Each structure stands twice: as C-alpha cells, then as structure tokens.
Design an enzyme around this catalytic site. Structure first.
Site, PDB file in Angstrom:
ATOM      1  CB  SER D 170      -0.937   0.016   1.213  1.00 18.29           C
ATOM      2  N   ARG D 171       0.616   2.155  -0.933  1.00 24.88           N
ATOM      3  CA  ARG D 171       1.404   3.379  -1.026  1.00 24.88           C
ATOM      4  C   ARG D 171       0.995   4.380   0.050  1.00 24.88           C
ATOM      5  CB  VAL D 172      -1.615   6.837   0.361  1.00 33.47           C
TER       6      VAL D 172
END
Ligand SMILES: Nc1ncnc2c1ncn2[C@@H]1O[C@H](COP(=O)(O)OP(=O)(O)OP(=O)(O)O)[C@@H](O)[C@H]1O
Ligand SMILES: Nc1ncnc2c1ncn2[C@@H]1O[C@H](COP(=O)(O)OP(=O)(O)O)[C@@H](O)[C@H]1O
Ligand SMILES: [Mg+2]
Lengths: 51, 506, 469, 202, 119
Positions: D170-172
């Site tokens: 997950s990036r954010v």
C-alpha cells in the site's frame, strides 16, 4: 554406504519435485506465448488484406 | 464506397441501350482474370457451385455469385483466359462419374481418365457436395477391417464405417499404413463373398507426379489395382481441382456402400486439402481467420468425413472407411488443422519419428493411438489374445525407465521387462508384408502366455518365420479353424498350447 | 407474406433484397423452397442498407441462383416445445430427423428470446440432489446453474448423463434435454440406441429426455444455433409446467467455435487466439437463460473441453465464469475399482459452503476432503517405506481412507448390466449420515470391501454381515 | 458495488445477503450482466463513478468497487473491433490504457476548500493463471496506489483470504491507518514475508 | 531549451514518464488515416521519437541533463516503444521485475544496465 544411499534418495526426490514446479511454470508461459503467436500472426494478415 | 462489375467498359453499355444482348443468364463476359480467378460479368441464371466453360476450353466453377459479377474459379491455367472472353454455363452442378466401371483406371478430379485405357463405363452421376448419412440410417460398427499389421489389429482395431486418422510427421509411417491395409484385402476380394470385400479408394492430393506413378505401379504387381480407385490430383493443377478432390473421391466410393458392398477411402493427405481450400478463398475477396484460413475451416473437413459411415440392414448393409492422413509439423498433435481432424474422427493413429529409427516398423505409439469402437469391430479369435496383451503393454511402458539398471531388478520387474520386449518386437513387420487373422492369433498367444520368454531378444525375428512355417505343415487344422469360425472354443485352446510347447524346445 | 429476391450467395452468407417497409429485422428466419429439402432456413444477421439485409443459411446453399424467391416467416427460428418433443430427434430448425412422423405440438416458441430479469431471479442458491454419493457430498450442483463435465474417452461420461436424468425424473419429476451441438455422425446414432435399451427414451411408452441433433457436417449457421434450439425446449417446461429441467450441451467447446465461424465470414475482425470479438456477449446470452425463476429452474450439465490442455484460453476462461459446479472425471480410477470415476478432490463447486448446505453438511464435506487429500499425498512414502513404518494416528487414518473412497462409488440403475449389482439411489440426508458415522469410529471394525458398490448407511451393515457368514 | 460482467444469478444472490445484515440501505448497486450489449457493460464504470462523485463533492466519503476490471476491458474491445480499428497487444485498441486510467483518476481525496470528501476505488483484476505481467494487468497496477494479490496456491490450503505479504503493498496506507493497530503490529509486514521464504526451504 | 540557449544554464529535464508520449499518438493514429505498425503502433514511431529526443541534448551554449523514465509494456523490452528509445540515451537503467520481489531496493539489473561513461 547406507548413509550415502539414503542421502541420494532425498536429493533425487527433491530434484524431481523441483523439476515439477519448473515444468508447471514453463507450461503457463508456453500457453500464453502460443495464444499471443496466433493473435500476432492473424493481425498481420488482416492488416495487409484491408489496405 | 466503390464497387466492381459496371466500370468504364461495362459502364458504357447501359447508357445507349438497356438491352443489347438478350442472354445475360446462360452466358457471361470475363472482366478480370488472374490468380486462377475469373470475374465473369452476368450469368444470372447460374446456380451456386455450377460448372462453366470459357471460350478457350478451360472449365470453371462459379462459387462467388455477386450482384453484378460472378466469381468463378478456373480449373486450368490463367493464360488461356483474357479480358472480354465469353464464358458459357453448363447448367449443372459439379458432379463426377461413379459406378463399377471405374475400378482399374486412374481418374482425375472431374472423372476424366488419365491412365490411357479408353473410356470408363459410368453407371451413374453423383454430385461432389452431397449430404452425409443421418442418425436413423446408421448402425453399429460390427465388421472388422483387416489391415495386416500385428500392432493395428490388436491395439487400435478399426472397423467398417469408422474414421481412422493417420497422424504423423514427415517420413514416419503415414502412407505406409494405408498402403498395407489396401493390399491385405486380396484374400477376400479374389473370392466370391461380396460382403467381405473392400474396394480401396486412394485419393492422392498434394503429391507430385512421380509419387502418383510409383504407388500405382506397386499395386499392379501384387494384383491390387483391379479393385482400387485412384484419384489423381497433383499440385501442378489449379487450386479448385485439389480442393474438390476429397468431395469427388467420396462420391465415387459411395456407390458401393449404397448397393451392398464395402469401400475404403484414403485421403492422402488431409493437410494438403486444407491448403487448397484456403487459396481459392483468399483470392475471392473473403475475410480470413486462424492460420490464414476461412471461416468454414472446421466444416470443410467434417462434412466430407461424416459421409463414410456404416449403413443399417434397411439401406443395403454397406459401409465406407475414411483413412485421412494428417501431416503434422514437428510432432505437435495440438495444432490448427491437426486438432480439427482428430476431434471429428473416431480414432487416430500417431506416428513418431523417434520410434522409427530404433527398430519399430512401423512406428505406432500404443500410448497415443486409440480406437473409439473398441473390441466391438474385431474378430472373436483375436480379441481373446488382445485383452491380456493390452494390460502387459501398458505396464511395461511406464516401467521402461528401469531398463538401464538391470543389476537392480526385482522378481516382478524382470518379468515385465522380458515379456514387454518380446511383445513389441513380435509386432514389427516389414514393408508390404501383411499377415492374416490366423497367423497373427498364433503369434500373439505365444508371447502373452509365456512361451517366448525363454528365447533371446535377437532371436525374435527368426522365431516369427519358423513358427509360422511349422504351423502350416504340422498343425494345419488349427489355423484353418480360427479363420473360418473366427473364434476359439475349449478344444482350440488345448491344441494351441501343446503345439507351441513342443516347438519351443528346439 | 413478405417476399424477397436473392442478390448474393457466397457460401453460408446469402444476401436477400426486400421491398420498402416489408424488410425483416435481425434474427429473423427466412424460408426458401428447394428441391428435395423442405425449407432452407436463413437467419437474418444485419442490414447493409439500400433495401438489403445479409442472412446466414442454416443448411447447404448449393444450387441457389440469383433471383430466387425468399419468403419471410415474420419471426425467429421457431421450434416445437412441450411434451411432444420427448423421445424424438429434433434439429436446429425444429424439424424431426428420426423418421417417426411430425411433432404434433400445440405452440412453437422462438429460439431467440430474452433471459430473466433481476426481479424474477432466485435470491438464494439452492442445491440440486443428483442421487450419487460423491455428488451430493463433495461438489454439489446448484439449482439453476452450469456444471462442467470434464473427462476423457471411456471414463464414464455417457453413463453419468443417463443416470442423472433418470434419478431426477423419479425423485423430483424433471425432464432432460440432450443437445449434442458439434457432435459426430457415429456418436449421434450410438447415443439414441443406448438410451432405448436402458429405459430413458421409449417409443411406445413414455419418454423423459429430448434429443436435439447437431452434427458438424452442416454449415456454420446450424452448429451455432443448435444451443438455442435445445435451450428453448428445456425452458418451456420450467415456465409453463414448473419443473427442474436439465440441459446437456456436448460439448461446450463446440458452441464457442461455431459462433466465431459465422462472425468471421460476415466481415467482423477476429479477437485473441483467432476468436470472435463478441465472445462475452454470445456466451452470456445462452448461459443467463438457464437460471432459476419463480416457477422452476433449469440446470446445465455441459462438457467443457480445454483447448490443447490450456485453461487460460479464450474458450476456457469465458465458460468457467458462469459454471457453478464441476464434475471432473479423471482417468486415475475407472479400472481401479470405482464406479464411476469421480474425483473427490478435483471436482469443486461454489455451492459447497456452510451458508447454502448448512453447518452439518459443511463439516462432513470438509472432513472427507481432508482425509482423501492426506492419503493421496502419502502414497509416495507408503511405497518406499511400507505400511507398518508409521505412527498410531497415521495407521488409523490410512485404513479409513481406503473404505471412504469406495463408499462414494455407488452402482447406478442404468449400469446394472456391466457390474451385476442393483441400482442404489441415496438421498441427501442418507449420504450425510453415513459419512459422519465412518469418520467418528462407528464403522472402524468393518472390512474395506464392505463399502464398495454400496450406497447409504443401511447397505454397509447388510453387506458386511453377509460377507463372512 | 458495480457488478460488470457477472452472471444474472450472481447479482441477485449478492444483493439479498447485504439486505439481511443491514448493509443495502446505504449502498448503490450497478447491475451490468454479460447478457446485455457491449456498450452497457463498458459504460458501467463511467456511470457508477458519476453517482459516487456527488457525495465526495458535498462532504461525504464514498467507496466504489469495480468488479471486475477484467470484464470491462473485454466489453470495450468488442465495440472497437467491429468499427474497423487497429488491434495492438492481446487484440486491444490503442485507447485501452486511457479508458482505465481516466475512470480511476477521479477517485481522489479533495481538500478542505472543496468539501473535504473522498472517493475510494476497489478494482478487481481477474488474472489468467497468476500472470501479473499481462496487458490488462500492468495497466491497472501502474495507475493505482497499491494492489492486493490473491494467489490461488494458498487459497486451497485453508488460508482465507490468501493475501501475499511479499506481493501486496500500500502506497498511502501507512499514514491513512489507525495508530492503535500500527503500534501493536510492529514490523508485521516484514516478518510475514521473511517467514514464508524460510518455511519453504526447511 | 530557452534557459540553455538564450541564458546558457545547465537545465535538468525530468520526464515521468517518457513512454506516454508514444502511447498517446498511437491511439489517434488510426483515425487520421495511417495504417497500424508493430503491436498496433503508428508507422512514424522512429520519426516522432527522434524529433523530440534530439532537441533535449547539450549544445555549445548550454547543457541539458535529461533524466526521463521509460515504461516497459507488460514487462517486455522488445516492444516498439521501449527498444526505439534505447538508441537515444547515453545511460540506461533497466529495472527488472524479478529482482524487485526478492528484496532488492531498487531492482537495478547489473546485466542489463549499460552506459557510455563506463571506461
Ligand atoms: N514399416 C516400415 N518398414 C520399413 N520401411 C518403411 C516402413 N514404413 C515406411 N518405410 C519407408 O518409408 C518410406 C516412405 O514411406 P511413405 O510413403 O509411407 O511416407 P511418405 O509419403 O514418403 O512421407 P512424406 O509424405 O512425409 O514424404 C518408404 O520408402 C519406405 O521404404
Ligand atoms: N457404474 C459403472 N460401473 C461399471 N462400469 C461403468 C459404469 N459406468 C460406466 N462404466 C463403463 O464405462 C464405459 C464408458 O464407455 P463409453 O460410453 O463408450 O465412453 P464414455 O463414457 O467416455 O462416453 C462403459 O464401457 C462402461 O462399461
Ligand atoms: Mg504419403
């Protein structure tokens, strides 16, 4: 001699099991390459016949 | 946007008068010729797949009937047709001659004789594009087709009315199995039983001129060309003649099955017939599909193979066999034209190039070739020995990897390796050397019981000729009873075991 | 009647020119008088304009001239439905091909029709009782879905279709509809004669399964429309009479190949692996009609064939998205002593959950699948280390797994002439109670041969006491 | 929920399960079966994003689930192949990547001057045998901020759901999580990927 | 280009990504009358990419360090948009997908990355 023969059976079973996983991964890549070769060859004959 | 037909030359004719010629139905004018395709303008009364005739003498088949023009495929060279030539219509469809007078002469794709033996007494005229048999006029495959090979009569036994495919690579046993099966019918065609005879129908399509002359000369020397139809269709002709070779040969062979006799068609090859149909469709301005083929690729081969079926007793009792040879590329049986012919036929005989160089003659893989009819279309005498040999051949193939380590074999492993090697070497026969049903039943019983395990592996070739010659002079009553009755009782099993045990001691 | 004139004839595609206002719509059957044939059906595909529409013939177009009379029927390809089509061999145009007279039907429904709406569908997934011990416990069939029957030749594909149609007509009262699209010429004649000797198709009595002829010897229009003709007769029994009909499409791969042949010859561009562009639209129009309504359901038991052993192809992945169950028939059993060769680990279904079959059926299915998976993986070590070189827990689980594999293979009613045993029809409640008692230790003292060729908990107690004494 | 490409029986059974657990009173269902035309299934992603954008522009959160992304690409290629277009990789047009990137870019989080709402996108990609390097697989992974890989090997052993720790990320997702769950799970993503590689070789 | 020619400064061009310039023109090339090329691309692939990459170079008035990034189509370096851009770059940094799953941060392939300053 008994320890070397018992260790050779474990190495042969691990090599046969590792060959089965590589053959399953190569079969998935060969199936995708066979479908892409039929689509690329049919697109070349359809482009030249429509021009 | 633009269209053909009326263009420049053809467009400057209706402006001055809307009549000119009173025909425009039975005749036509050629507007564009090339690549074996002639765009004849007119011919409104011409039906689909009808024969035509040009002004120079070349025939044509109108298959692409447009609204302004008519696409006809010429059966000859394109140098004889030009722009503005008159093209007349014959009024009939593409038919060919049939009957009993065609046996003994080599005909072409239209029914004309090319062997140089005069005319052919044709008793009827049948169309090329004919319908196949229904589900109510067909019966079960009960008659047995004697091929002569020991590995074909025991494993994948073919019957009358079925379709057995001959798959294989280049020079691996494709045309060899079809030539030996037609030459093995001399024991039944030379007699008086009309139900036991089977007229061959070799349809050479795609081969050269030297290959058709060599196959016809070998069958005449062994008295096998008197009741075998030869459909000559070389690759030097047009694409319309090679593509219609499968439909013309099936119409001539259907006259014997509809009267009370049996036939056997050998379409050699199935790969050459598919290339001829795609060449005429690509030049008629049509859309292609997979592997540069038309949309009706699967329907072109399934319609000609479904007509060779076994009729019931209310239709005459005849049958027709279809032996199509599928020339594969490099052993890949799951291709485009290979998968369509194997799914429509009721069995396929695979031929590998690796087993032909080892010593197996012919190279017939037992693990890849199978028959959909099973043991229902075979003799009762040969079915008793083939039942035990099928289980021993399947178990020896899976345990064939232990042959390199003979110093670590057990009791059950040494018995399967010795019995499996003698059974595979006994079924290997030479070229043009077919065996009968009585000679193959005695050789298969000696290897399945255990009478051939004491002999060596190199002496398997000498034991096949010594046991067959001694059984014809000492125990001739056992060989004649197995061929007439076709089965084996309790007295035939005890007499066969005593004769094989006395001859194995020397 | 609306009449037309033939303007073009290039193989299966034939263009007809109508008048102004009397032009037919899409999916309209066109009548054409021939010689020996009755009427040449020609389904309308699209309209090219200028009072002309291209149509696809469903038979041979040989002998047609430019300017022939083409009459319009006014609707689609109608077929005979009801109880009169049972026991007769119908075609794609609704005509008999069995030479047993015409089908005296009261009404004729069209093959081109819409499916059910979202408000008339089933809100819950129900299980379909088949009668087999390895089908009602492992991969259960959903009421109104699709089931894939994968298997080779001589494994038991023809015997499984005949036993499932007879068990559903006696326990639930539902008919069948065998639509062999893309079959062979010899396979159609052998299937009709085998059903008459078993009691499925009676000429003088009462039949219970419909026969739809659809060989590959015709053109591309007859093979593609063979699936719509067989599905229209099975859907009429669930909407008018209300019965759980079972549709059979042998094979499922022939329906996808026939649709791309008529589309490529019309002018459409191909897709992936030489397939048609509307692959998801042609396959979804026929699979959505075999669902569950307020009056009845329509099960589907087609035989899906993988292309060159590839499940990620365009003809295999498109048909697997709508299949709720799967009846995989591997070649490992058959001759091993299982009737029939039903794989308990390869055959999976989406209806084998605890929210559809209950908490009692989910616990018995998970316990039988765990014991069969552990015994199959331990087969490589039992052949190299023997059977006595194990622990106490491994020795007890290996003995119970051998009897559980033969207990699910019960003898069918139509296979009594091949095995000699009587036909056993176990219900859903009897199969769940017999599998739970063997896994708890109540039948640990019984032999391994007492459960073979038997069905239910009462058949195992009577066969074990009569084997010794 | 935007059911695109699903069957007719699967859409009716999924709506009945959400209503029994008090979850269908505040959820939009976009029915788009495969039995309709090719234009209705391809426009199901654009029509569902317009209805969910009204809540994000007023002061509310929305969650869109495009099930599935693989079914929407097959419906758009059917209408383009019939209009005589150029087919690229996997028989797809040149605007195949622009159709999925334009519909996923609208599901973003607004600032305080626009209302303060946000729109979450949950696209499901149906892989063919785990081929994550396909034409439709690489186009959806390059436009989304993370992915959830679902391997078929661990799903048959009982690990439900089969979420690969070495593939899904997950990036954010680090700053947009709870502080109580992130403090108790110290180095849980790094210890889960290292334990899977050591157990396969032992 | 104006800061390096009219002013004479070492500009730094950062494109992300450079593969989107060739993919955007291929979708509009079918409606302009041009025939499709390899993998459904435009026929002027080498002419459109060469006219924009030649202007982002170092001249006598100023330099221009171009640091663009290319996108591999479905993990394939033999595509028409990836192989045509390798002949207009002094240093290449190929990122393989197999080394990223092992734990390499980043997945710098040493057997594929090459440059002209490695002497
Ligand atoms: N069982 C066999 N034993 C010995 N020789 C064989 C056998 N089968 C075939 N041959 C040899 O193979 C050669 C070719 O046989 P055949 O005509 O059946 O194949 P072909 O038509 O030449 O194959 P292709 O069309 O690929 O060239 C023959 O000259 C023959 O001598
Ligand atoms: N319940 C059963 N018990 C014993 N044998 C069976 C049973 N079901 C099927 N078989 C066998 O399986 C064979 C199937 O033959 P066939 O129908 O020709 O092939 P397929 O089943 O592949 O169509 C039959 O010969 C039959 O003996
Ligand atoms: Mg040959």
């Amino acid at each position: 001699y008994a320890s070397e023969i018992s260790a050779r059976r474990n190495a042969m079973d691990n090599a046969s099991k590792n060959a089965g996983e590589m053959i399953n991964k190569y079969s998935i890549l060969y199936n995708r390459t066979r479908q892409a070769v039929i689509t690329n060859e049919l697109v070349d004959i359809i482009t030249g016949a429509s021009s | 946007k633009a269209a053909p037909t009326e263009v420049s030359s053809i467009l400057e004719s209706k402006i001055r008068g809307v009549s000119d010629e009173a025909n425009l139905d039975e005749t036509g004018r050629v507007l564009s010729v090339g690549d074996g395709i002639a765009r004849v303008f007119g011919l409104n009364n011409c039906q689909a797949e009808e024969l035509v005739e040009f002004a120079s003498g070349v025939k044509g088949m109108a298959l692409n009937l447009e609204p302004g023009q008519v696409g006809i495929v010429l059966f000859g060279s394109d140098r004889e047709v030009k722009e503005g030539e008159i093209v007349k219509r014959t009024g009939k469809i593409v038919d060919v001659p049939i009957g009993p007078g065609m046996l003994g002469r080599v005909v072409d794709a239209l029914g004309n004789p090319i062997d140089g033996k005069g005319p052919i007494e044709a008793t009827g005229y049948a169309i090329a594009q004919l319908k196949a048999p229904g589900i109510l006029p067909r019966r079960s495959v009960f008659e047995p087709m004697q091929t002569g090979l020991k590995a074909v009569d025991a494993l994948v036994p073919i019957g009358r009315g079925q379709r057995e495919l001959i798959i294989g690579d280049r020079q691996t046993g494709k045309t060899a199995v079809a030539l030996d099966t037609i030459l093995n019918q001399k024991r039944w065609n030379d007699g008086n039983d009309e139900s036991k005879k089977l007229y061959c129908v070799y349809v050479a399509v795609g081969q050269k001129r030297s290959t058709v002359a060599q196959l016809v000369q070998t069958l005449e020397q062994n008295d096998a060309m008197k009741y075998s139809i030869v459909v000559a269709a070389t690759a030097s002709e047009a694409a319309p003649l090679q593509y219609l070779a499968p439909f013309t040969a099936c119409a001539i062979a259907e006259w014997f099955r509809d009267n009370g006799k049996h036939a056997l068609i050998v379409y050699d090859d199935l790969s050459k017939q598919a290339v001829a149909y795609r060449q005429l469709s690509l030049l008629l301005r049509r859309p292609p599909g997979r592997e540069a083929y038309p949309g009706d690729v699967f329907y072109l081969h399934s319609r000609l193979l479904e007509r060779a079926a076994k009729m019931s007793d209310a239709n005459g009792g005849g049958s027709l066999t279809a032996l199509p040879v599928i020339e594969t590329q490099g052993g890949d049986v799951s291709a485009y034209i290979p998968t369509n012919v194997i799914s429509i036929t009721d069995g396929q005989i695979f031929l590998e190039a690796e087993l032909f160089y080892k010593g197996i003659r012919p190279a017939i893989n037992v693990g890849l070739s199978v028959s959909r009819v099973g043991s229902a279309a075979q003799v009762k005498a040969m079915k008793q020995v083939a039942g035990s040999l099928k289980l021993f051949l399947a178990q020896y193939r899976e345990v064939a990897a232990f042959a390199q380590f003979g110093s670590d074999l057990d009791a059950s492993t040494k018995q399967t390796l010795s019995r499996g090697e003698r059974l595979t070497q006994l079924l290997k026969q030479k070229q043009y050397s077919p065996q009968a049903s009585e000679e193959q039943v005695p050789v298969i019983y000696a290897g399945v019981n255990g009478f051939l395990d004491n002999i060596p592996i190199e002496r398997i070739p000498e034991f096949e000729e010594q046991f067959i010659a001694y059984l014809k002079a000492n125990e001739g009553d056992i060989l004649e009873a197995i061929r007439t009755k076709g089965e084996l009782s309790s007295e035939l099993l005890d007499k066969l075991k005593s004769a094989t045990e006395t001859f194995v001691a020397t | 009647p609306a009449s037309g004139k033939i303007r073009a004839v290039i193989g299966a595609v034939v263009d007809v020119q109508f008048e102004q206002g009397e032009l037919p719509a899409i999916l309209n059957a066109l009548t054409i008088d021939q010689g020996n044939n009755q009427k040449l059906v020609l389904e309308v595909a699209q309209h090219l304009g200028e009072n002309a529409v291209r149509a696809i013939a469903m038979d041979g177009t040989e002998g047609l001239v430019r300017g022939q009379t083409v009459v319009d029927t006014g609707a689609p390809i109608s077929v005979p439905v009801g109880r009169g089509t049972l026991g007769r061999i119908i075609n794609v145009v609704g005509e008999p091909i069995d030479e047993r007279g015409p089908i005296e039907c009261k009404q004729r429904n069209p093959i081109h029709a819409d499916p059910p709406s979202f408000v008339e569908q089933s809100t819950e997934a129900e299980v379909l009782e088949t009668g087999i011990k390895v089908v009602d416990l492992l991969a259960p069939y959903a009421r109104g879905g699709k089931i894939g029957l994968f298997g080779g030749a001589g494994v038991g594909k023809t015997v499984f279709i005949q036993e499932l149609i007879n068990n559903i007509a006696k326990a639930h009262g539902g008919f069948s509809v065998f639509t062999g699209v893309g079959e062979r010429t010899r396979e159609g004649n052998d299937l009709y004669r085998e059903m008459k000797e078993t009691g499925v198709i009676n000429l003088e009595g009462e039949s219970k399964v419909a026969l739809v002829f659809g060989q590959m010897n015709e053109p591309p229009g007859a093979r593609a429309r063979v699936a719509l003709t067989g599905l229209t007769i099975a859907e009429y029994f669930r909407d008018e009479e209300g019965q759980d009909v079972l549709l059979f499409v042998d094979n499922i791969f022939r329906f996808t190949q026939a649709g791309s042949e008529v589309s490529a010859l019309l002018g459409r561009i191909p897709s992936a692996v030489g397939y048609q562009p509307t692959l998801a639209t042609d396959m979804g129009l026929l699979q959505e009609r075999i669902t569950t309504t307020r009056k009845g359901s329509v099960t589907s038991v087609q035989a899906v064939y993988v292309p060159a052993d590839d499940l990620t192809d365009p003809a295999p992945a498109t048909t697997f998205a709508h299949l709720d169950a799967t009846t995989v028939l591997s070649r490992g059993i058959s001759e091993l002593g299982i009737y029939p060769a039903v794989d308990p680990l390869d055959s999976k279904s989406r209806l084998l959950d605890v929210s559809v079959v209950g908490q009692e059926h989910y616990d018995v299915a998970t316990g039988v699948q765990q014991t069969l998976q552990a015994y199959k993986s331990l087969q490589d070590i039992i052949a190299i280390l023997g059977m006595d070189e194990l622990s106490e827990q491994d020795k007890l689980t290996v003995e119970r797994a051998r009897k559980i594999q033969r207990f699910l293979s019960q003898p069918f009613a139509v296979a009594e002439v091949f095995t000699g045993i009587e036909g056993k029809l176990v219900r859903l409640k009897d199969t769940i109670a017999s599998f739970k008692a063997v896994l708890e230790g109540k039948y640990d003292h019984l032999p391994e041969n007492a459960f073979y060729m038997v069905g239910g908990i009462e058949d195992v107690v009577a066969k074990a006491e009569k084997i010794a004494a």
